[PDB]
Write an enzyme that holds these catalytic residues in place. Structure first.
Site, PDB file in Angstrom:
ATOM      1  CB  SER C  98     -40.040 -33.994  -4.272  1.00 49.81           C
ATOM      2  OG  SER C  98     -39.496 -35.101  -4.955  1.00 49.81           O
ATOM      3  CG  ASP C 230     -32.038 -33.283  -5.420  1.00 48.69           C
ATOM      4  OD1 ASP C 230     -32.095 -34.538  -5.547  1.00 48.69           O
ATOM      5  OD2 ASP C 230     -33.088 -32.620  -5.277  1.00 48.69           O
ATOM      6  CG  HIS C 259     -34.830 -35.199  -3.350  1.00 47.73           C
ATOM      7  ND1 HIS C 259     -35.122 -34.332  -4.375  1.00 47.73           N
ATOM      8  CD2 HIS C 259     -35.981 -35.857  -3.067  1.00 47.73           C
ATOM      9  CE1 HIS C 259     -36.392 -34.478  -4.721  1.00 47.73           C
ATOM     10  NE2 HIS C 259     -36.929 -35.401  -3.947  1.00 47.73           N
TER      11      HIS C 259
END
Lengths: 279, 279, 279
Positions: C98, C230, C259
């Site tokens: 991320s 996600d 995610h």
């Protein structure tokens, strides 16, 4: 405060500690998976009695380095050795709870007892927790395999389950421990190194029988104290055997108390420590 | 950051602090049992206005040393003195909330005000909180005895009860503070030194009346601000008396606001601080 | 451990880090708003495979300095540069999750790749998340404005809402993540600097397209991995574009994963990393 006890690759291994009051030094060594503040109901009484109270956090726990290596009692004892040498403590009273009882015995075995005035073992691991051909009194290995798998599997959910049995919550929640205090125990637990949730399992089940010989042969005042409803360290597999092996020790069974008796039965623990330290 | 302010046995007493932005320095001194981040709704506005904003955590709280000793305003003021001297702050605006209002007055009394541009007292302890023969306006001692016993009795459950009254949750939960923000307050609280939960009680009820004389005689711009529904520090026992004693101070009553008004009435607090600092 | 990467006024900016095991170094760079322990299900496998695993906490997060300044990828990359230079790491595998995928690309762009053996991008920001006239594939700005306002508005309530979408809790709570693990994520989140909750929003939406050119031109083994469900970084706005831009990279879509797939789909992530690092 911090005391450096080693290195893990490029990082120093630092143990968080607190050093309070004045008088004869008393070192309190906490249990899994808490930290030095878990002693708060004992600390404040010992300070009021005129002792210098030191706690430190075991590697991987509380404020100490979140290491991957050294979750074994030879290392935990070497850490304690470094704490005592660094602070140059003399005539020290060592007090262990749960995992902390391992530091006491292994320390005496590996380093002797010149600095030590007294030893108090609360909710002891000793003498040898896991069943083996030469240790028929122990608990079957599968129990520890299951714990290791749960703690590795999801340490967050594991700590919740562990504390239910730690405090006997079915009996004690709302009478001897609040929901909020349980939550405080969980918040401290999840701050430990992820690996420490399960890496300590093999350490818990080390053979301490030769260390118990060292402790007994030291001939220093010794206290062994255990709850009769301890569902983490069954009293017949631990304290009663430890008592048989060290008959000279003062011996206290706290009726109805769980593993987490520093909190739930603080009064009984405090009364025993007060009497013992006054000797 | 950390600033060393003393020693407790073998350990340095270190105060955690943050030092952000550029411009005239403003030091924000938090209340019990929170830390410097409790100012977040004020900090970000002061930074946007072009001030250098410094917070630190009182000994025993937040990121600062978890000491057993020195929970009194002479010590808290000496800590502040060391912070200001170490950072060599000049023309500083001091802002206290709840316990922090004690640092401001005791600091001026003990050390003077050469470094100080302005003083802001939010949710003040002053002038003297506990009822005595020579302080008939104060709150009966038994209130503080009860608080001390509760905070010592089980600090985890105590902080829950305290925050209900801190924020007036019956009125404000879900409208001026979320359940999650309350939980954040509790998580910060339980990180404080166990002894700090109750050791601060005698400090809260110190006599600040002579310190108030020092503050008034300094003749520096002063702000006194309080919520009218403060159930921790009753407005008639504190701010209204403080206002009577220092009539030259700017004076703001925030209608309907609880003790925890940095959060619940951030807009009103910010508006008052913006006006005051612009002078 | 800590590594100094700069200063914020009178305070050093220190990044907390851990350095474990032996073997080829692998640096894992966590996502918002977690810390290096969020990698625990990956860390323990990489250690078992004979890698030296290093994590550090991004400024503002976890154990690192709670700064007000430098929440941008030029700064985040300079921080990473300082970590790699300080530890003098060679033949390093960089792994970002991320936000951490931003450090990887910006680092290569600004500093080159002499120290770098391999790059793994998990749940990537790349190439350019926000819709613009020259970036029609991006997500409308209003989404990020709303997030920034929510995170600034009440970060405590915001983190709860964020984690619902982070982990797809409607689908995954009780099957791929426990309530307790979610709570652990929230406890870590609220420890971050208050300002960091929203200051990172503009960093997330930086243009990485020129950095992607640097990464591709490096010609080092590269992995791009993303969950198909996600809901934080939509796969068509990120990974599928990144894959189109760097067709030489190994490419993995984890079917059904959210995610927060380091936890929920640890097995699939671990299998991909094991294969990739073995090359």
């Amino acid at each position: 405060g911090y005391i450096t006890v080693g290195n893990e690759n490029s990082t120093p291994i630092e143990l968080y500690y607190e050093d309070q009051g004045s008088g004869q030094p008393v070192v309190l060594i906490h249990g899994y998976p808490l930290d030095g503040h878990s002693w708060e109901r004992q600390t404040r009484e010992l300070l009021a009695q005129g002792y210098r109270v030191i706690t430190y956090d075991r590697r991987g726990f509380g404020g100490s380095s979140k290491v991957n290596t050294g979750y074994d009692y030879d290392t935990f004892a070497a850490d304690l050795h470094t704490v005592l040498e660094t602070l140059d403590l003399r005539d020290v009273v060592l007090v262990g709870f749960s995992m902390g009882t391992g530091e006491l015995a292994r320390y005496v075995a590996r380093y002797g007892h010149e600095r030590v005035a007294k030893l108090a073992f609360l909710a002891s691991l000793e003498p040898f927790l896991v069943q083996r051909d030469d240790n028929p009194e122990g608990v079957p290995q599968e129990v520890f395999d299951g714990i290791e798998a749960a703690a590795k599997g999801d340490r967050f959910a594991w700590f919740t389950d562990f504390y239910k049995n730690f405090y006997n919550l079915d009996e004690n929640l709302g009478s001897r421990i609040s929901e909020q205090a349980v939550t405080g125990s969980w918040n401290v637990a999840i701050g430990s190194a992820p690996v420490a949730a399960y890496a300590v399992v093999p350490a818990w089940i080390e053979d301490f029988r030769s260390d118990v010989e060292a402790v007994r042969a030291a001939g220093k005042p010794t206290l062994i104290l255990h709850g009769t409803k301890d569902n983490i360290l069954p009293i017949d597999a631990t304290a009663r055997r430890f008592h048989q092996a060290v008959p000279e020790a003062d011996y206290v069974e706290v009726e109805g108390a769980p593993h987490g008796l520093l909190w739930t039965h603080a009064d009984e623990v405090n009364a025993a420590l007060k009497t013992f330290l006054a000797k």
